[PDB]
Design a protein that fits this description.
The structure is cut from a larger assembly and holds one copy of chain A, one copy of chain B and three copies of chain C. By secondary structure, chain A is of the alpha/beta class. Chain A is built from 16 helices and seven strands. In chain A, the strands form two sheets. Chain A has a five-stranded parallel beta sheet. A two-stranded parallel ribbon of chain A has the order 6-7. In chain A, strand 2, helix 5 and strand 3 form a beta-alpha-beta unit. The longest helix of chain A has 22 residues. In chain B, strand 3, helix 6 and strand 4 form a beta-alpha-beta unit. In chain B, helix 5 packs parallel to helix 6 and helix 15 packs antiparallel against helix 16. The radius of gyration of chain B is 26 Å and the shape is elongated. The relative contact order of chain B is 0.09. The longest helix of chain C is centred in the middle third of the chain and has 12 residues. Chain C is mainly beta. Classes of the chains: A alpha/beta, B alpha/beta, C mainly beta. Chains in contact: A-B, B-C, C-D, C-E, D-E. The structure holds phosphothiophosphoric acid-adenylate ester (2 copies) and magnesium ion (2 copies). The site of one phosphothiophosphoric acid-adenylate ester (AGS) has 21 residues of chain B, from helix 3 and helix 10. Chain B: Keywords: Acetylation, ATP-binding, Cell cycle, DNA replication, DNA-binding, Nucleotide-binding, Nucleus.
């Protein structure tokens, strides 16, 4: 069966729960027409390719097949292609409504060579009245400044907790899945603003266990055991925290980097203890993370971090 | 002949029934293949867990003895770029088999070293050609794979080998070889493995070589500890005892003679003393706090160099001052 | 059983030269009306198809068809013993594990005999030839070879374009572009040099130069080459034999 | 513009064969009195200089000189379509980005046309030829090729020594030493086999065998080769064409200098 | 001293072509009745033995035998200057450190002279030839070359079997097996194509194909090849020269012995 990322892939700009400003901008553009050259940059899995696909579809109607030229990184996008095929498409005659234009979608624009990017300048400049260019990339710095000067720049940001939660609730309502609040919270926590990864983890948890619960999510998508990390940090005695770290995290194959990073997140988002003790625990966690990043990542460093956190909590 | 391969290669599983440790994933994969619905697999796990052996035995069970021809196996040793994908993988997926009739199998072993552009080009190959071919991605780190590629495959986490399965494999090896193993020696062997069958097989071959006999005797803990290397538990406990009870100068002399008689390293002794003192039932946790803090500081200092004698004296003084609070 | 005697070992050697390099496995089948053989390359863009009628042989006997597969490389390795003028007899029983090649000189003198190990290949002969092609043309094969050898240097793709009374081969790559334009013409001074063209519909297809280079080898079997092109199927390049033909079907580049 | 038609594509192919391998970039310039071309190797010890007068062509038209640079390898890659007997026409506008090579058979039949991309090279033609050389000699080029091919096997350096009525080529290396001694002589039975020598001063120069090997290629353009040597400048090896010549100027080894 | 002049440098070049590749060091010895040379490969399964009588030379003078050893590769490197038609003179003093090869054209014109460094080899010529061999046969050498070239492709071992009026060469390996069967016959239309066989005892020996391949080179020296086989000694393959012969003695494979 089709995955939920592809099955429930948005086909209308209203279904996108991304950045509201740019979404309404593109919606008004598709409503009025006169789409300009654009470059959409951001991070993977936030609704960049789907956004430009929806814009092109809504703007071209039934003429999407013969008015949109899609070129991904999977196809050759060198100097020869830009010289021959893109120029032939831009010079192609096509009867369109008096508010629409031919769209050239270029996915993964940050991978095009310098020669092709240089040749695309006059290609998009001489046919800017019947052909429009939409680039979708992750690093806007990889595209030359002359190309960026002839187009709008749309920087997509991370998706807040509310938007991903709303989209997951819509998907659950459309799929009739049994879930719980802590399970969705763990899913969003493991997603890190990645909507595609969130939907993928949700579908995997559903197809693997049926019930979307935090235990299952931290099991089918087991990585550092956050709740377990919180229970380890919130321990009252040193031996209990040491036994938890040994049995639950270290004896199960959790890497030290995941443990310390999950540890940082738990602390930052902690609310049981005061602000100063939280900052001191983050400072200890931060030093331990620095030491690990240097390749000294072992169990002794995490044990010393826990000992220092307990000493801070020891008044 | 197979008698020339090392024990890690000689005892490679050829069928799915010889892959121990993984039961929840092995049964699920067997059911996938028997019922027919075999999705794109993503075997994620630590080294030496049996992912490559599992997928090789799976392809053998699927296609028969002609596996080496009906399966496209790519790895980090082979050039895996975006053009390599575009040509080879797409031509393999789009075409059909030259030896029989059925779906194809592309085993992308160690695909965590592939370029981001290669994965971006392959994520649409997996989604387009999905009725005549399948994809199996083997990984040790799930952070090197793009989330788009990570979401198209069913993820199977290879857990470290437990005690029962590793002891079963050890018994199988002891049956295949004219060799005997002591129970406590077997336990010590399982302790220094961390669920890595490669290490167990290697050190088993090495201790069989250490026997020096026609194998009429047994392999005890002494053989394993002297052969596997690393400060022996005997010298470890002797140094710890001399530090805890004996005099400062005597403790220094003992540590020096122990680390210079066998050429041991100070970091290995530090880790061993940390592992041993973890079982010590101690008084108020201040001693444990001081011990862990000072030992981690000394380890981080050793990780950058310095004077070995100064660091050894620091270890001795740290352990002593930490235990002086237990009175 | 298989029992086919070629007057000159040379004919068989040139035929195999045609399968050579571009394919690894060949599936032969002898029967009452002759011998056929098919080989497909790994990427499946090229099919080499042979047909040798009973009359091409000096002696042919078949009371029971036999299908046999073999490694092309192994076969050519053995296919340089024919002295060209030697007589060659292909021999095999009804359930063969091998194919026997028997080369003999006129006199009883020297007899070179080989027993080639066979491969098991699932019998699955393709029948992809079309009733009508968009355009059909024939020209001297040496001319076609030159045309291919010219353009090959410029690109990995050579385009063939056909319009009324015009055939144009084109290559365009890094160092520049090239083209060879030929026109239909009847030479009575010797019609084996004429260039015929029958166009039902203009065609414009692109082929991988590496493959056209494999195909030109057929020049050694025939003076002329027939090229049939269609926008609906693989192109057909054909080299006629006395009672038979060697055909190369090549899929256009998408 | 450039518009030069060679009767036989073969002449141009042999000329380019001469630049081949030993140089990478060639700078051509067509003008009212013909075409010239110069190419210098990377180490700058060899200069290949060509001159083709208007009369060497079947048709030549020039109302505006054009200078064009190109990669030699690219040119030769394309220079095997001439059928030798084909007609070849070099064509270019006054401000070219390419050079067009047009090969045609007598009949309208087959037309092979190429459009070669040009390289931008700073125009800087050298004029290093001397008024007088210490010694001058000519001999059959096939003979010169053999002499070079002999000695080459023995060393990376071949010495040319000239004294009154004596020309001596010498190589000396690891396996031993070799020498070829030739004497001036007029053969009336056919003077294309004669060996002329005019010596104003004895000369003794050493050249890198790898370069002399590149130079011998000119045999395919002329029956004889002229060799002009001087202790003051690069040596000149010249192969005459009908209305033109191909020249190779080679710097003597200082002790180690090709 | 050594002083041997070959009419055509070509004869010596073909002779050396025979030692070429299969051996590295050759020990020559000139004397009153001619020149002999022996070379044994490293594995000691092949001995190459030459004999050139006084009459094979245009001029030969020897008042004092000289033995000299040399590297075969060095010699062949120098052995492509003969123009084939050049005259070749081998020259050496009684206690040489080198061997001089002097190639000259009819006219005084060109003289290529080489001085090859010699190697010191303990003089120890072998005399392993037998009085009688189990079987003896001769046939055109081009035919023998084809027979060897056929079978070589199939295996690293080629077996020669002889029975009354039958000679059979066989190879059997991975891809299959092959055999060439020849029968004795007198062709009066030209007896240089006949195949003679004298069998005193049936023989059946196996040889390493790599070695037979080295041996076939002798075809260039003689129209026919003589093959003498025995179960007691190395086989002898012989190529006759005008006054002389080139012989190859090859040890049969024991089961694995070239
Ligand atoms: N704002 C969104 N609303 C709903 N679904 C979304 C949203 N953003 C992403 N998705 C889901 O994520 C899938 C993939 O989104 P993409 O737009 O391809 O990700 P991306 O932002 O382009 O980042 P890339 O492609 O890795 S550079 C879609 O098919 C949706 O299922
Ligand atoms: N579950 C197992 N049962 C039996 N033997 C095993 C098992 N896992 C590993 N081995 C042994 O270890 C060898 C190596 O196994 P591999 O599958 O190559 O390791 P891996 O899981 O692929 O990890 P890599 O290759 O370092 S990413 C095998 O040939 C076996 O001898
Ligand atoms: Mg995208
Ligand atoms: Mg592996």
């Amino acid at each position: 069966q089709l995955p939920w990322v592809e099955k429930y892939r948005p086909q209308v700009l209203s279904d996108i729960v991304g950045n509201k400003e740019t979404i309404d901008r593109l919606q008004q553009i598709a409503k009025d027409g006169n789409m300009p050259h654009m470059i959409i940059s951001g991070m993977p899995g936030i609704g960049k390719t789907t956004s430009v696909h929806c814009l092109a579809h809504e703007l071209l109607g039934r003429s999407y097949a013969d008015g949109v030229l899609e070129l991904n990184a999977s196809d050759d996008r060198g100097i020869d292609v830009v010289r021959n095929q893109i120029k032939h498409f831009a010079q192609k005659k096509l009867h369109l409504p008096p508010g629409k234009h031919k769209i050239v979608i270029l996915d993964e624009a940050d991978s095009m060579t310098a020669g092709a990017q240089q040749a695309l300048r006059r290609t998009m400049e001489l046919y800017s009245n019947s052909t429009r260019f939409a680039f979708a990339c992750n690093q806007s710095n990889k595209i030359i400044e002359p190309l960026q000067s002839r187009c709008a720049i749309l920087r997509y940001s991370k998706l807040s907790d509310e938007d991903v939660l709303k989209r997951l609730l819509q998907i659950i309502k459309l799929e009739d899945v049994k879930y719980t609040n802590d399970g969705l919270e763990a899913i969003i926590f493991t997603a890190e603003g990645d909507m595609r990864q969130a939907i993928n983890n949700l579908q995997s948890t559903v197809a693997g266990h049926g019930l979307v619960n935090a235990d299952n999510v931290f099991k089918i998508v087991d990585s550092p055991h956050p709740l377990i990390v919180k229970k380890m940090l919130l321990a009252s005695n040193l031996e209990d925290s040491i036994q938890i770290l040994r049995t639950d995290l270290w004896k199960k194959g959790y890497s030290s980097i995941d443990i310390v990073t999950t540890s940082f997140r738990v602390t930052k988002n902690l609310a049981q203890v005061k602000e100063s003790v939280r900052l001191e625990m983050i400072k200890e966690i931060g030093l331990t993370h620095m030491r690990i990043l240097e390749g000294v990542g072992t169990y002794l460093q995490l044990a010393s971090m826990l000992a220092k956190i307990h000493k801070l909590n020891n008044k | 002949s197979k008698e020339n391969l090392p024990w890690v290669e000689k005892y490679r599983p050829e069928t799915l029934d010889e892959v121990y440790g993984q039961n929840e994933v092995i049964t699920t994969v067997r059911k996938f293949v028997d019922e027919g619905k075999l999705p794109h697999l993503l075997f994620y796990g630590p080294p030496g867990t049996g992912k490559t052996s599992t997928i090789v035995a799976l392809a053998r069970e699927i296609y028969g003895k002609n596996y080496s021809n009906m399966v496209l196996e790519l790895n980090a040793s082979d050039d895996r770029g975006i053009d390599v994908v575009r040509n080879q993988i797409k031509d393999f997926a789009s075409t059909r088999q030259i030896f029989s009739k059925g779906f194809k199998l592309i085993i992308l072993d160690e695909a965590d070293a592939m370029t981001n552009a290669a994965q971006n080009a392959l994520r649409r190959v997996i989604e387009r050609y999905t009725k005549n071919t399948r994809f199996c991605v083997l990984a040790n780190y799930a952070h090197k794979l793009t989330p788009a590629l990570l979401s198209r495959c069913t993820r199977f986490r290879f857990q470290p080998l437990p005690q029962e399965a590793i002891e079963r494999r050890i018994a199988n090896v002891l049956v295949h070889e004219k060799l005997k193993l002591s129970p406590n020696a077997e336990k010590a062997l399982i302790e220094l493995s961390n669920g890595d069958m490669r290490r167990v097989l290697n050190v088993l071959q090495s201790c069989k070589a250490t026997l020096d006999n026609p194998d009429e005797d047994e392999i005890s803990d002494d053989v394993i500890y002297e052969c596997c290397g690393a400060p022996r538990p005997s010298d470890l406990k002797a140094v710890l005892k001399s530090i805890l009870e004996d005099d400062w100068g005597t403790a220094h002399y003992t540590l020096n003679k122990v680390r210079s008689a066998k050429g041991l390293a100070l970091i290995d002794l530090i880790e061993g003393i940390v592992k041993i003192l973890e079982d010590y039932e101690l008084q108020n946790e201040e001693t444990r706090v001081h011990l862990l803090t000072k030992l981690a500081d000394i380890e981080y200092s050793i990780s950058k160099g310095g004077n070995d004698q100064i660091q050894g004296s620091a270890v001795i003084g740290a352990i002593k001052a930490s235990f002086e609070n237990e009175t | 059983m298989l029992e086919a005697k070629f007057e000159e070992a040379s004919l068989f050697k040139r035929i195999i030269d045609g399968f050579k390099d571009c394919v690894q496995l060949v599936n032969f089948q002898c029967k009452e009306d002759g011998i056929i053989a098919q080989a497909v390359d790994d990427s499946r863009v090229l099919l080499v198809s042979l047909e040798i009628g009973v009359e091409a042989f000096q002696e042919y006997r078949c009371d029971h068809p036999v299908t046999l597969g073999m490694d092309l490389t192994s076969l050519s390795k053995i296919l340089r013993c024919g002295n060209n003028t030697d007589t060659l007899t292909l021999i095999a029983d009804n359930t063969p594990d091998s194919i026997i090649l028997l080369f003999e000189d006129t006199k009883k003198d020297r007899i070179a005999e080989y027993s080639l190990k066979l491969m098991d290949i699932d019998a699955d002969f393709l029948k992809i030839e079309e009733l009508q092609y968009d355009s059909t043309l024939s020209l001297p094969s040496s001319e076609f070879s030159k045309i291919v050898r010219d353009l090959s240097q410029l690109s990995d793709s050579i385009n063939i374009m056909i319009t009324k009374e015009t055939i144009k081969f084109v290559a365009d790559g890094d160092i520049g572009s090239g083209s060879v334009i030929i026109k239909p013409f009847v030479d009575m001074e010797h019609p084996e040099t004429s260039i015929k063209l029958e166009m039902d519909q203009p065609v414009d297809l692109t082929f991988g130069a590496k493959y056209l280079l494999d195909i030109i080898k057929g020049s050694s079997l025939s003076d002329r080459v027939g090229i049939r092109l269609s926008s609906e199927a693989p192109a057909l390049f054909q080299f006629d034999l006395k009672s038979g033909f060697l055909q190369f079907f090549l899929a256009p580049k998408f």
